[PDB]
Design a protein around this motif. Structure first.
Motif, PDB file in Angstrom:
ATOM      1  N   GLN B   3      88.030 -25.815  35.316  1.00 41.28           N
ATOM      2  CA  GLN B   3      89.370 -25.319  34.936  1.00 41.28           C
ATOM      3  C   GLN B   3      89.815 -25.970  33.469  1.00 41.28           C
ATOM      4  O   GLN B   3      90.322 -25.393  32.597  1.00 41.28           O
ATOM      5  CB  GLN B   3      90.632 -25.923  35.807  1.00 41.28           C
ATOM      6  N   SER B  13      90.855 -24.987  22.184  1.00 38.53           N
ATOM      7  CA  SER B  13      90.304 -26.215  22.020  1.00 38.53           C
ATOM      8  C   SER B  13      89.054 -26.221  22.723  1.00 38.53           C
ATOM      9  O   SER B  13      88.739 -25.226  23.419  1.00 38.53           O
ATOM     10  CB  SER B  13      91.299 -27.230  22.371  1.00 38.53           C
ATOM     11  N   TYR B  14      88.461 -27.388  22.902  1.00 41.64           N
ATOM     12  CA  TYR B  14      86.968 -27.667  23.460  1.00 41.64           C
ATOM     13  C   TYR B  14      87.042 -29.050  24.320  1.00 41.64           C
ATOM     14  O   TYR B  14      87.499 -29.901  23.860  1.00 41.64           O
ATOM     15  CB  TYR B  14      85.858 -27.997  22.273  1.00 41.64           C
ATOM     16  N   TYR B  15      86.879 -28.714  25.552  1.00 38.44           N
ATOM     17  CA  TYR B  15      86.807 -29.795  26.517  1.00 38.44           C
ATOM     18  C   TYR B  15      85.457 -30.345  26.570  1.00 38.44           C
ATOM     19  O   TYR B  15      84.651 -29.451  26.935  1.00 38.44           O
ATOM     20  CB  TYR B  15      87.167 -29.264  27.836  1.00 38.44           C
ATOM     21  N   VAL B  16      85.154 -31.640  26.466  1.00 40.45           N
ATOM     22  CA  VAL B  16      83.837 -31.991  26.754  1.00 40.45           C
ATOM     23  C   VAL B  16      83.810 -32.698  27.973  1.00 40.45           C
ATOM     24  O   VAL B  16      85.014 -32.980  28.511  1.00 40.45           O
ATOM     25  CB  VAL B  16      83.377 -33.267  25.652  1.00 40.45           C
ATOM     26  N   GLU B  17      82.568 -32.837  28.804  1.00 42.11           N
ATOM     27  CA  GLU B  17      82.859 -33.626  29.850  1.00 42.11           C
ATOM     28  C   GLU B  17      82.564 -35.134  29.579  1.00 42.11           C
ATOM     29  O   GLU B  17      82.375 -35.472  28.572  1.00 42.11           O
ATOM     30  CB  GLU B  17      81.724 -33.098  30.840  1.00 42.11           C
ATOM     31  N   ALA B  18      82.693 -35.991  30.767  1.00 38.77           N
ATOM     32  CA  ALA B  18      82.250 -37.298  30.507  1.00 38.77           C
ATOM     33  C   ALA B  18      80.781 -37.313  30.672  1.00 38.77           C
ATOM     34  O   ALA B  18      80.290 -36.485  31.062  1.00 38.77           O
ATOM     35  CB  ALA B  18      82.941 -38.189  31.743  1.00 38.77           C
ATOM     36  N   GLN B  19      80.164 -38.439  30.210  1.00 38.54           N
ATOM     37  CA  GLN B  19      78.695 -38.643  30.048  1.00 38.54           C
ATOM     38  C   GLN B  19      78.309 -38.930  31.645  1.00 38.54           C
ATOM     39  O   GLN B  19      78.862 -39.372  32.177  1.00 38.54           O
ATOM     40  CB  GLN B  19      78.159 -39.721  29.138  1.00 38.54           C
TER      41      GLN B  19
ATOM     42  N   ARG E  99      81.005 -43.170  28.089  1.00 33.75           N
ATOM     43  CA  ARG E  99      82.185 -42.555  27.951  1.00 33.75           C
ATOM     44  C   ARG E  99      82.712 -41.416  28.493  1.00 33.75           C
ATOM     45  O   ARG E  99      82.098 -40.638  29.430  1.00 33.75           O
ATOM     46  CB  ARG E  99      82.620 -42.416  26.308  1.00 33.75           C
ATOM     47  N   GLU E 100      84.317 -41.133  28.290  1.00 35.71           N
ATOM     48  CA  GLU E 100      84.980 -40.251  29.221  1.00 35.71           C
ATOM     49  C   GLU E 100      84.962 -38.865  28.703  1.00 35.71           C
ATOM     50  O   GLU E 100      84.528 -38.173  27.898  1.00 35.71           O
ATOM     51  CB  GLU E 100      86.315 -40.559  29.140  1.00 35.71           C
ATOM     52  N   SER E 101      85.563 -37.819  29.716  1.00 34.41           N
ATOM     53  CA  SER E 101      85.784 -36.554  29.143  1.00 34.41           C
ATOM     54  C   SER E 101      87.287 -36.485  28.375  1.00 34.41           C
ATOM     55  O   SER E 101      88.019 -37.254  28.622  1.00 34.41           O
ATOM     56  CB  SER E 101      86.046 -35.626  30.413  1.00 34.41           C
ATOM     57  N   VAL E 104      89.048 -31.853  22.656  1.00 40.88           N
ATOM     58  CA  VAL E 104      89.149 -31.900  21.110  1.00 40.88           C
ATOM     59  C   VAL E 104      89.565 -30.349  20.571  1.00 40.88           C
ATOM     60  O   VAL E 104      89.240 -29.454  21.146  1.00 40.88           O
ATOM     61  CB  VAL E 104      87.865 -32.243  20.226  1.00 40.88           C
TER      62      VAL E 104
END
Lengths: 134, 183, 51, 37, 119, 171
Positions: B3, B13-19, E99-101, E104
């Motif tokens: 989601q 916008s852009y959602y990155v995930e956690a590593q 690190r986290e999600s 941006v």
RNA sequence: GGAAUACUGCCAGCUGGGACUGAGGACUGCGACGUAAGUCAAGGAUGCUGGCAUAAUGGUUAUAUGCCGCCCGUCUUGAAA
RNA sequence: AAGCUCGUAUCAGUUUUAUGAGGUAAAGCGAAAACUUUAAAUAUGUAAGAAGUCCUUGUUUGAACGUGGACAUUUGAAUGAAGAGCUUUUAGUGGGCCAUUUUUGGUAAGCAGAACUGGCGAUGCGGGAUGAACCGAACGUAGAGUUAAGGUGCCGGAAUACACGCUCAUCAGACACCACAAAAGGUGUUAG
RNA sequence: GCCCUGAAAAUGGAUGGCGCUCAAGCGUGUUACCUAUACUCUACCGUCAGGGUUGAUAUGAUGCCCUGACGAGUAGGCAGG
């Protein structure tokens, strides 16, 4: 790191089989250490003077711990007074045998000690000096 | 997780995930003709033989190890389906020694009920959610003994980099295909 | 004396994981997800289409 | 040797000064006996 | 500048004769000219013992125990706070975590796409 | 392998007092998502001083063909650093999709120029819309009105190892 | 504008075919199934049926075929012969 | 090999963290490349707690030493591990080959000297037609299954598979190759 | 890029041979297939290791039972036959 003693004495192996029955099923710290000394060499079973016992009874409140030596007991005429105590070991020399009893003490084999103290209660273990001989 | 990607695109916008905070490494190269510097490292991972496999809590310090042994192993991030099977089919506990198979929860609770863990899935939960007792939970398991893969390896020659048409390296998601083939 | 692998031999699966019984009950892997109509913002579409 | 910056196993460098002062003065000792004869 | 016996020093030669160049040992001897610094060195797979003298303007007093001297005192500093509070200190040094999600926004930042255009 | 085309966005990591760098984006032809990111940081070193540990990927996406049925006419810039210093090369491929075209090119470059996959920069692949902008001869060959040509010498693949007929091209 | 499919991923979804294995030997455990009684694919195979009752299988022994396989020991560590 | 002298929480051909130095030049930009801060990896040292610290305030305001008291385990990064020392004794073996890595000096050309790590010896097994050093490969006895390296016209087990291009050789090539003849010649072709 | 030249002898000979030319060549992509004493599983032996076990009546207690991991090797060292 020895498991069975080198000696082919039968009677010695009788005591070995007894304490293995004790050390497995009595969970007391005493019975193991007594057994572990039974596999030792002639060097590692140093003879203990009667006087070294007389040091022990001079300690605090320990005039009634039954002193037990795995090795042999020797006599030493350098002392003169000697207490009335309860001693068990393997071998008593004739000097060692007489002086204890003439003091009034009692001389006992180790199996009877196992009967009297299965959990090794109110006892005492000594060892002779290994670093005497080079 | 799905989601947040969807909301960012509607919000432009852009959602990155956690590593990805957990990896699974398999030793590939054999036992001989290895420089000593990596060969110390594999012993730290309990990768004592070919196709043995274990997990690593991803740190900075751990990540430097995979840069050291990169021509020798393969790794990526495991998914839930992949983790669940190795606990099931290839899971082996360790009671003082002895590579003890799991076969019931009561073995686990006898060991890690000290740490709350009493099921088999608690342990699986403690893996994929890297938790407070992960070190003991990872140390409890025996290193996974895997077979050589069913379909094979893909590439004809193994020892090139997976990016360059070989086998070794990071294969972040594609490790999930290879493990089930080796299960 | 013998390791009975789960993921077959369902009795040993039920030796573990009593929840796994109801997992196949509510069928829980062919769970459907509802759909939502959330179109992305057009800037995102442009940057994808952009050369 | 006396000016370089390490040693590779009491100072050693002044010993190197001393042993030359033997051998310098050994010229000076061997100077005299040929001045006698 | 005072050197005592037991100080931990590093080598920084202020050439081409011998090279340790950034290696660290301890000081056992002091005379007026040089100081005695002794060094571990492996041969085979066993460490040797290298007594060695050095002109004292080439050798610096090393500080390497600096953060550790802080961190024992830092733990006790946090420990004083730890008795004053119902809290876990978490005094351990930790590795860097992944690190986290996060989201941006391309709002003031349009993605300036690029290639070897050349430029 | 059959490639894919990838939009790859990276933003090298915001520091204190530098939030939000400028979201660099490339179009990457590659097989899978792993090679693309590996290919991605490679260009980012040549362009300027960013490096792989210094930054991160924003996002990666696969670009489908907008018209995977329509036959298109493609113009391709390739430069490559051989055998001495580099030089451009412009070849034209009449083909179906973008990812279809690059495949035959890598087949072409490995045919003639012994060109590795590492050896090659794809600068830009452009669709030529208008006819008579297509410049090469052999691409212009297939464009004339009402094109017909035979097949000569039609072999037939046998299945079994014997036949009884003295088989002939058919015809 | 509305659908389908490809692709990749999951299912503690269902079902077929093959091949190899059958350790262990009263009972105990973990279970599941059933209202229960009790049952079970649950701490390792049993059931049914035929043939033969001897050279039939097997062994041993010649020989043929296929595939591999140089002369030992000593001495120089390799042209290591 | 024999032992009791340890079965403790102690160690490690390893990283991280801080601190080092070679600033190799790549920031960079300053005052008119001439900064002096600073930005990487290339291999390397040192350190990472319980005898651990403070306080008490003496010795010989500091410092170098001390009396005494307080501070437990989220006790002081990661990760792996009961095999660290002892006292005894004591078999063999001390000269040799190959490769890589730096580094110094070299010339017809081979090299030479160092430092370092591998392999070999003492070691079979699959592959490379065959081979001390090439590729793979953890040697009890068998069964099943899957692979490595290398292969799949025929010897020879495995696709005369699929896909695109290129090449005709009056001794093509199937490889030792990123070397030697090697710098070129050619109205041979193909693509630029 | 391939192609030919780009010196090289002297028994008869070798891409391993046959031979192969939109290859059975070269470069490259795709799957499929073949296979080791390698690995996965099971049995068996053997060592080591960790557990249990004088209780009579019956047995060897240096025994028995459970559990695990391992198994190259000259000079040599030890043990059991």
């Amino acid at each position: 790191h020895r498991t069975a003693p080198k000696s082919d004495n039968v009677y010695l192996k009788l005591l070995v089989k007894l304490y293995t029955f004790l050390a497995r099923r009595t969970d007391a710290p005493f019975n193991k250490v007594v057994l572990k000394a039974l596999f030792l060499s002639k060097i590692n079973r140093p003879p203990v003077s009667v006087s070294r016992i007389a040091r022990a009874l001079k300690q605090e409140g320990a005039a009634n711990k039954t002193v037990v030596v795995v090795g042999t007991v020797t006599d030493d005429a350098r002392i003169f007074e000697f207490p009335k105590t309860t001693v068990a070991a393997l071998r008593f020399t004739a000097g060692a045998r007489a002086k204890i009893v003439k003091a009034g003490g009692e001389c006992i084999t180790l199996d009877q000690l196992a009967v009297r103290a299965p959990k090794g209660q109110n006892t005492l273990i000594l060892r002779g000096p290994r670093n005497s001989r080079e | 997780i799905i989601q947040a990607k969807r909301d960012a695109k509607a919000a432009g916008s852009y959602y990155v995930e956690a590593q990805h905070k957990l990896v699974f490494v398999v030793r590939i190269k054999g036992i001989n003709k290895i420089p000593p510097k990596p060969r110390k490292v594999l012993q730290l991972l309990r990768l004592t033989r070919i196709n043995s496999g274990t997990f690593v809590k991803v740190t900075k310090a751990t990540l430097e190890l995979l840069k050291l042994i990169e021509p020798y192993v393969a790794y990526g991030y495991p998914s839930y389906s992949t983790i669940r099977q190795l606990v099931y089919k290839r899971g082996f506990g360790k009671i003082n020694k002895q590579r003890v198979p799991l076969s019931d929860n009561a073995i686990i609770e006898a060991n890690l009920g000290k740490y709350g863990i009493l099921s088999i899935d608690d342990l699986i939960h403690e893996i994929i959610t890297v938790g407070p007792h992960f070190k003991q939970a990872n140390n409890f398991l025996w290193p996974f003994k895997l077979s050589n893969p069913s379909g094979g390896w893909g590439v004809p020659r193994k020892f090139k980099h997976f990016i360059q048409g070989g086998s070794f390296g990071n294969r972040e998601e594609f490790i999930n295909k290879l493990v089930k083939s080796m299960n | 004396v013998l390791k009975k692998n789960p993921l077959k031999n369902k009795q040993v699966l039920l030796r573990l994981n009593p929840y796994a019984k109801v997992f196949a009950a509510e069928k829980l892997g062919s769970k459907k997800a509802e759909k939502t109509g959330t179109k992305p913002a057009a800037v995102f579409t442009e940057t994808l289409k952009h050369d | 040797l006396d000016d370089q910056w390490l040693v590779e196993v009491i100072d050693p460098r002044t010993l190197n000064r001393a042993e030359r002062k033997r051998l310098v003065k050994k010229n000076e000792k061997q100077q005299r006996r040929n001045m006698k004869n | 500048k005072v050197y005592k016996v037991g100080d931990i020093v590093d080598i920084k030669a202020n050439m081409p004769h011998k090279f340790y160049q950034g290696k660290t040992g301890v000081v056992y001897n002091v005379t007026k000219s040089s100081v005695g610094v002794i060094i571990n060195k492996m041969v085979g797979n066993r460490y040797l013992e290298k007594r060695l003298n050095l002109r004292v303007e080439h050798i610096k007093h090393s500080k390497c125990r600096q953060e550790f001297l802080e961190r024992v005192k830092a733990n006790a500093a946090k420990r004083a706070e730890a008795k004053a509070q119902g809290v876990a200190v978490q005094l351990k040094r930790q590795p860097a975590q992944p690190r986290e999600s996060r989201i941006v926004s391309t709002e003031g930042n349009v993605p300036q796409t690029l290639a070897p255009v050349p430029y | 392998a059959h490639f894919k085309e990838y939009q790859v966005i990276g933003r090298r990591l915001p520091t204190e007092s530098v939030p939000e760098p400028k979201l660099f984006r490339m179009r990457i032809f590659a097989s899978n998502e792993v090679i693309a990111k590996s290919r991605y940081w490679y260009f980012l070193q040549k362009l300027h001083k960013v490096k792989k540990a210094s930054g991160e990927i924003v996002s990666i996406n696969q670009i489908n063909e907008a018209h995977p049925t329509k036959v298109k006419n493609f113009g391709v810039w390739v430069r490559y650093d051989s055998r001495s210093g580099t030089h451009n090369m412009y070849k034209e491929i009449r083909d179906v999709s973008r990812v279809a075209a690059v495949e035959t090119l890598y087949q072409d470059m490995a045919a003639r120029h012994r060109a590795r996959f590492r050896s090659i920069h794809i600068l830009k692949v452009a669709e030529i819309e208008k006819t008579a902008d297509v410049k090469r001869q052999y691409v212009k060959q297939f464009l004339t009105k009402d094109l017909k040509f035979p097949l000569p010498h039609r072999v037939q693949k046998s299945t079994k190892t014997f036949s009884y007929k003295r088989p002939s091209t058919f015809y």
